[PDB]
Amino acid sequence: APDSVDYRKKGYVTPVKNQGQCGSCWAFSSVGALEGQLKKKTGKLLNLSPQNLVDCVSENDGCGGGYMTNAFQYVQKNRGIDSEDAYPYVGQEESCMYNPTGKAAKCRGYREIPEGNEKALKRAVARVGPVSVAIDASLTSFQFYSKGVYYDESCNSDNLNHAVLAVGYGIQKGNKHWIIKNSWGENWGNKGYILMARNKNNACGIANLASFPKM
Ligand SMILES: *C(#N)C1=NC(N2[C][C][N][C][C]2)=NC([N][C]2[C][C][C][C][C]2)=N1
């Protein structure tokens, strides 16, 4: 263990989920960050509801994509977000079914990492916890990733098409990286995660759309 951190070993990360056919990566990413702050603030965490966000964040497009900051704003204005148990994931948008009795967390706003600043993202991951981020995950090599530290210069930092969650950082075999939680199931990548090159010119745009909720 070098100059690094891995929140999976600290109870700040819930099990890896599978968004299914639905383009809800942004909802899983948002919930992931919210869950981390729930643990930081209260000492306990709980699977929050991605469906709640898919069905109720009108500024977003449901299974057609969306932004994490919009989700954080919703939780704030809504005065809460339901737990997974109270508002189960069905993988398809349905009418907003938010129920305050199932509230499991709330937030008072959010902060965005300065665009392209990986040092700032590193500081946020160390001082805040899991951070919602967006990347270019369109490359076939990204999708079939299995191990090691992913680095492909063909990645387009101007084409963020998938939202994920930075749950740590460190170094493998001399290769600095970010520990990334995806939402394509535990069967994807390495147990649901991917190690992405860190301090390599903001590879794949990892620090271009990073944010976290405030509690
Ligand atoms: C996720 N999952 C996710 N899915 C989509 N789409 C739209 C195009 N067709 C597939 C489903 N879109 C987005 N948008 C985000 C990309 C990363 C930056 C914030 C928006 N996410």
Side-chain angles (χ1 to χ4, degrees), residues 19 22-26 63-67 134 160-163 209:
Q19 59 186 71
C22 182
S24 50
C25 55
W26 61 270
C63 292
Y67 295 93
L160 308 188
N161 47 58
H162 194 61
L209 194 65

Coordinates of all heavy atoms in Angstrom, one line a residue, residues 19 22-26 63-67 134 160-163 209, ligand 1:
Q19 N -26.8 -2.4 -14.7 CA -27.9 -1.5 -15.1 C -28.8 -2.1 -16.1 O -29.9 -1.7 -16.4 CB -27.3 -0.2 -15.7 CG -26.3 -0.5 -16.9 CD -25.6 0.8 -17.4 OE1 -24.7 1.3 -16.7 NE2 -26.0 1.2 -18.6
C22 N -31.1 -0.6 -19.7 CA -31.3 0.8 -19.4 C -30.0 1.6 -19.4 O -29.0 1.2 -18.7 CB -32.0 0.9 -18.1 SG -32.5 2.5 -17.5
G23 N -30.0 2.8 -20.0 CA -28.8 3.6 -20.0 C -28.8 4.5 -18.7 O -28.9 5.7 -18.8
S24 N -28.7 3.8 -17.6 CA -28.8 4.4 -16.3 C -27.4 4.5 -15.5 O -27.4 4.7 -14.3 CB -29.8 3.7 -15.4 OG -29.5 2.3 -15.5
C25 N -26.3 4.5 -16.3 CA -25.0 4.6 -15.6 C -24.9 5.8 -14.7 O -24.3 5.7 -13.7 CB -23.9 4.7 -16.7 SG -24.2 6.0 -17.8
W26 N -25.5 6.9 -15.2 CA -25.5 8.1 -14.4 C -26.2 8.0 -13.0 O -25.8 8.6 -12.1 CB -26.1 9.3 -15.2 CG -27.6 9.0 -15.5 CD1 -28.1 8.4 -16.6 CD2 -28.7 9.4 -14.7 NE1 -29.4 8.3 -16.6 CE2 -29.8 8.9 -15.4 CE3 -28.9 10.0 -13.5 CZ2 -31.1 9.1 -14.9 CZ3 -30.1 10.2 -13.0 CH2 -31.3 9.7 -13.7
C63 N -33.6 6.1 -19.1 CA -32.7 5.1 -19.6 C -32.0 5.6 -20.9 O -31.3 4.8 -21.5 CB -33.6 3.9 -20.0 SG -34.2 3.0 -18.5
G64 N -32.2 6.9 -21.2 CA -31.5 7.5 -22.3 C -30.3 8.3 -21.9 O -29.8 9.1 -22.7
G65 N -29.9 8.2 -20.7 CA -28.8 9.0 -20.2 C -29.1 10.1 -19.3 O -30.3 10.4 -19.1
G66 N -28.1 10.7 -18.7 CA -28.4 11.8 -17.8 C -27.1 12.2 -17.1 O -26.0 11.6 -17.2
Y67 N -27.1 13.4 -16.3 CA -26.0 13.9 -15.6 C -26.1 13.6 -14.1 O -27.2 13.7 -13.5 CB -25.8 15.4 -15.8 CG -25.5 15.7 -17.3 CD1 -26.5 16.0 -18.2 CD2 -24.2 15.7 -17.7 CE1 -26.2 16.3 -19.5 CE2 -23.9 16.0 -19.0 CZ -24.9 16.3 -19.9 OH -24.6 16.6 -21.2
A134 N -17.2 10.8 -15.4 CA -17.6 10.3 -16.7 C -16.4 10.1 -17.6 O -15.4 10.8 -17.5 CB -18.6 11.3 -17.4
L160 N -17.4 12.0 -23.7 CA -17.8 11.3 -22.4 C -19.2 10.6 -22.7 O -20.2 11.3 -22.9 CB -17.9 12.3 -21.3 CG -16.7 13.2 -21.1 CD1 -16.9 14.0 -19.8 CD2 -15.4 12.4 -21.0
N161 N -19.2 9.3 -22.7 CA -20.4 8.6 -23.0 C -20.8 7.6 -21.9 O -21.8 6.9 -22.1 CB -20.3 7.9 -24.3 CG -19.0 7.1 -24.4 OD1 -18.7 6.3 -23.6 ND2 -18.2 7.5 -25.4
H162 N -20.1 7.5 -20.8 CA -20.4 6.6 -19.8 C -20.0 7.1 -18.4 O -18.9 7.6 -18.2 CB -19.8 5.3 -20.0 CG -20.3 4.1 -19.2 ND1 -21.6 3.8 -19.2 CD2 -19.7 3.3 -18.3 CE1 -21.8 2.8 -18.4 NE2 -20.7 2.5 -17.8
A163 N -21.0 7.1 -17.5 CA -20.7 7.6 -16.1 C -20.3 6.4 -15.2 O -21.0 5.3 -15.3 CB -22.0 8.2 -15.6
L209 N -15.6 15.5 -16.0 CA -16.9 15.7 -15.5 C -17.1 15.0 -14.2 O -18.0 14.1 -14.0 CB -17.9 15.1 -16.5 CG -19.4 15.5 -16.3 CD1 -19.5 17.0 -16.6 CD2 -20.3 14.8 -17.3
Ligands
LIG1 C1 -25.2 5.4 -19.2 N1 -25.5 4.0 -19.2 C2 -25.5 6.3 -20.2 N2 -26.1 6.0 -21.3 C3 -26.4 6.9 -22.4 N3 -27.1 6.6 -23.4 C4 -27.4 7.5 -24.5 C5 -26.8 7.0 -25.9 N4 -27.3 5.6 -26.1 C6 -26.9 4.6 -24.9 C7 -27.5 5.2 -23.6 N5 -26.0 8.2 -22.2 C8 -25.3 8.6 -21.0 N6 -24.9 9.8 -20.9 C9 -23.9 10.3 -20.0 C10 -22.5 10.0 -20.5 C11 -21.3 10.5 -19.6 C12 -21.5 12.1 -19.3 C13 -23.0 12.4 -18.7 C14 -24.1 11.8 -19.7 N7 -25.0 7.7 -20.1

